[PDB]
């Protein structure tokens, strides 16, 4: 009980200290996976507003092993030894898809861009407002206002 509360407290200080990576890590620890999910949806929202994922020098070191460039030597020894097991590639895989989604749009790989967005939406953890945001930003203006796709009765039904 005492330990879990301290973790919650750490997260509040870390948010203040503008160490965005470290606050989520602390909430994970607090035993509140549900809250972890809620900041994930919010981070997706943030990443949409930026048009692309955030880059901090600490963030550059962890993520680099699935991202070109970005390997920046001389970040604390705790950060470097922890990540060696490749646990980060798995945990980062849903954010990575989002980030890759913008990339594919810009690369005029509009077919595949649609595919990644659909995969993310199918996960039932979205309730009705992390849906309102996506359709007006991406699905309706870019992909359904333009005709370039052949549908049929069933494909329409599923929609």
């Amino acid at each position: 009980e005492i330990a879990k509360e301290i973790y919650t407290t750490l997260g509040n200080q870390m948010l203040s200290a503008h160490n965005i990576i470290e606050s989520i890590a602390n909430f994970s620890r607090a035993g509140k996976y549900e809250l972890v999910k809620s900041y994930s949806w919010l981070l997706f929202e943030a990443s949409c507003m930026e048009g692309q994922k955030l880059d901090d020098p600490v963030l550059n070191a962890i993520v680099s092993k699935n991202s070109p460039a970005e390997d920046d030597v001389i970040i604390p020894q705790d950060i470097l030894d922890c990540v060696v097991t490749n646990s980060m590639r798995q945990t980062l895989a849903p954010y990575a898809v989002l980030s890759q989604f913008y990339e594919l749009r810009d690369r005029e790989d509009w077919g595949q861009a649609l595919r990644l967005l659909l995969l993310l939406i199918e996960f039932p953890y979205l309730p009705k407002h992390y849906l309102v945001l996506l359709v007006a930003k991406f699905l309706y203006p870019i992909f359904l206002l333009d005709d370039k796709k052949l549908m049929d009765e069933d494909s329409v039904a599923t929609v």
Binding site: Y33, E34, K37, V97, L119, F123, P124, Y125
Partner: peptide, 25 residues
């Protein structure tokens, strides 16, 4: 993706459990 899906499923199961607990209340 697999990990994320698993986590989501776990969360959903937790929610179900909570609902059942309240259902009995």
């Amino acid at each position: 993706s697999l990990r994320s899906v698993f986590a989501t499923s776990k969360e959903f199961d937790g929610p179900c459990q909570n609902e059942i607990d309240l259902l009995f209340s």
